[PDB]
């Protein structure tokens, strides 16, 4: 199965594979049942931004959800990644519906890489940033129903002409660039990403969550992962 | 065939294609033959570092080679890119030998692009800065006899165990993912590029050059483009 | 007097000193009178964004002004600002008003600056990035009528409580730390600005207009220098 | 008296106070004592770099000290800065030396700093960069027997025409600008500083230091603070 590293915005409680009982932020290493969980108080309809770090020196993955004029949920969790991800990499962003929907739009995606090396003044680095998203946006890979284009827009999940979301739907979007995440002569390590997203839904119960991950370089949807798996894991184990 | 745009740090006047009587940088548009040339004091055996900036703005493209303590070559020409180039592109390092021989050496390579729009905060950026080559640069496309990992650098064409370049090679470093290299709803466009490399020579006179070029995303090292055509063009037209 | 370099939004047209019979934007050196300028549809009550590049190697000072979903304004003079500035300056934002006015908000603000000598991999660099005003901005040396908190906003010039703008008002504001825009070793200097800003007024001929400058450290308002000579000008000469 | 918060990299332990009985690197706040150190292998002579790194969502200032293919001391410790010092800072570098001394040499400084807020796309950031220091360095504030432009380095303390460094001197260098360290609102702070030094005495016996200071604006040079009080504390408490 295929390697992952994820941060999600959990917005259906699974009670049944260890979801909290609420919307929550938590941090996955490897399985979909998080290591660590925040309670998050989502806001149908408002325009949100997600924060996440990671250094090599701490070695902490922290993310920040919050939402304009409202307070924002941290999450924190330590982990060493040089020693549960590859060398070299992709990341991206997932998302889905499952028996209930919801839109899991995505406004902006930023994301940096520094690599700093042993011998002075020998940084390797990464980034990028989309304020807009094209038609043929040729340098993201989309998988699943992921489109672009809807008002310079990146949609995950799947949507009807009347701006309607529907259920058991998988998208994602990954950078095309493989990247560099860790390296042994490397003194520090870090990486952060950002990105804004506007979740809607018509239910009183909003489903499933979008999630921002890292991942091995040929990384695909697993069979059968809408809903409760948000496009990353084979299984809820 | 690939559409090419380029800047050429020239080490042999190839006298019967318009090349100057001595070594110089030029600025190729689909055409071997430079629209502007300038003089430059190829100093062999040195490092040296090149810089080229362009904007939409005012529609010039420019370039600066230098060597420590010495002088510095110039060159710029304008030209809107948009009429020239497909939107979308790779961008790349070339270089070649014939008869004559040099190192074709690479030790530094950046590059930024931005793409700014009409609406506020609107901005598409994209960087990367190589310092050190590893020996599996998963991010480069290398063409040709170019290979990455020797002393952390890359090197374009073919370099003998004893540190002795060989005649007649063609290599090319493509960064993987593709550039946006325009846009219509832009109203700025730019990019500036910057790598340091190291040209020897045992040869009287060394050939052929080191060249930064913006080509289409599938584009490769054309046939016969050894020596004077500095593996970037088909013919000499 | 001060040694002035300035790109100025004017939006009223004195064509006794030598101004186009409509609002325009112009390249400021040393002196009010325009050494080229370029017609500017300004629209009254929207948010409006100028941006301002220049490099060492083309020699160009060029600047663009642009409304969401309508025209552009551009404008180029060729300029060896080495030949005009001293070594050390400071930037600035500055604006004026007279017997007719406007409002001069600046709604952000940012600025880079790139001195990179003959020495290989070495760089010196300063960047800025105000988003957003707080009422005790101590990075901002505010000279005038100007003020910083209101709304979040830099005014420029003096303004009243239900809003309206004051005639006879002149403002501007400098960051804090000395630019170093030039120097012998240097191979390439370049600088880059931003600025978004909101002009209206009541009566239907707003006045004077913002600009955006370079001057020595120990730089202070003209004397009588409020209306036509937008607060950087002794005289309109 | 002031108010500080630095990362020391101590040659000299001066153990009735606290100094382990070794070199090292270590984190203190309002007091020579360190909260936290990590013994450090210091090789008199070589090159070196240090990496400050701290954010506000896991609340941890970190540091990295290291030389080419060698050892790297780490050191970390969690701590809120916002309940420590005041919204608005100055931040720069320190050395000393007493009966004992040593050359501290800077040979290149970096800092950026980013506030983030909950409002979406409303951050704020400054970033400056020294790769040469000049005879006139203009933005910085020099105190004590610190100066610049001596082979484009900048020596902290004072060394003779020759080269001998001297006993009982003190110097610092601030940045010009005063830095916002943190808003009552901002989602995210979030620092990184980053210096090459070369600390070296001719006889086995290096002392005090260098270290990377936060103070309050007006921070002058404490009365006796030279060699083990390494020009930051009033005292040993
Ligand atoms: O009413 N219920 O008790 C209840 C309804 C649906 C349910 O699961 C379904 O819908 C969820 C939300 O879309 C997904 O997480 C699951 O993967 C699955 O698609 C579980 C319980
Ligand atoms: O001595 N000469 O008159 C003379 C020597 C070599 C020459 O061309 C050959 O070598 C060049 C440099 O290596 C290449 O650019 C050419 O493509 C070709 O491989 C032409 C004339
Ligand atoms: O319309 N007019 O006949 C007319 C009215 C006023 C005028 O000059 C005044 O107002 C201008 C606009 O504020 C400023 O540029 C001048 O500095 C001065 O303050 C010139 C012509
Ligand atoms: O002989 N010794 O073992 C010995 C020599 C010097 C000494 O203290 C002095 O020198 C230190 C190093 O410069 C400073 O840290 C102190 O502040 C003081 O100025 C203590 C013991
Ligand atoms: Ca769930
Ligand atoms: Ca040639
Ligand atoms: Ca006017
Ligand atoms: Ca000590
Ligand atoms: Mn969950
Ligand atoms: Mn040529
Ligand atoms: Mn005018
Ligand atoms: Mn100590």
Redesign the interface.
Same mark, same amino acid.
């Given at each position: 199965a295929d390697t992952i590293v994820a941060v999600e915005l959990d917005t259906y409680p699974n009670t049944d594979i260890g979801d909290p009982s609420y919307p929550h932020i938590g941090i996955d290493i490897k399985s979909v049942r998080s290591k660590k969980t925040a309670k998050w108080n989502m806001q149908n309809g408002k325009?949100?931004?997600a924060?996440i770090?990671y250094?090599s020196?701490?070695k902490?993955l922290? %993310?920040?959800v919050?939402?304009? /004029?409202?307070d +924002?949920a941290?999450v924190?969790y330590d982990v060493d990644l040089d020693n549960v991800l590859p060398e070299?990499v992709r990341v991206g962003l997932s998302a889905s519906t499952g028996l209930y929907k919801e839109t899991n739009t995505i406004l902006?995606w930023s994301f940096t890489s520094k690599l700093?090396?042993?011998?002075?003044?020998?940084?390797? %680095?990464?980034?990028?940033?989309? /304020?807009?998203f +094209?038609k043929?946006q040729?340098?993201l890979i989309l998988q699943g129903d992921a489109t672009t284009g809807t008002d310079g827009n990146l949609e995950l999940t799947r949507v009807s002409s009347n701006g309607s979301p529907q259920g058991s739907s998988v998208g994602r979007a990954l950078?095309?660039?493989?990247?560099?995440i860790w390296?042994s002569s490397a003194?520090?390590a870090?990486f952060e990403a950002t990105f804004?997203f506007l979740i809607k839904s018509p239910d009183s119960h909003p489903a499933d969550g979008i999630a921002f991950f890292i991942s091995n370089?040929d990384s695909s949807i697993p069979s059968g992962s809408t809903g409760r798996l948000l496009g990353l894991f084979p299984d809820a184990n």
């Open positions: 325009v949100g931004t924060h770090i250094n020196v701490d902490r922290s %993310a920040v919050s939402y304009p /004029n409202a +924002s941290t924190s070299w902006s700093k090396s042993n011998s002075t003044h020998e940084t390797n %680095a990464l980034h990028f940033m989309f /304020n807009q +094209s043929d040729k340098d950078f095309y660039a493989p990247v560099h390296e003194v520090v870090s804004t370089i």
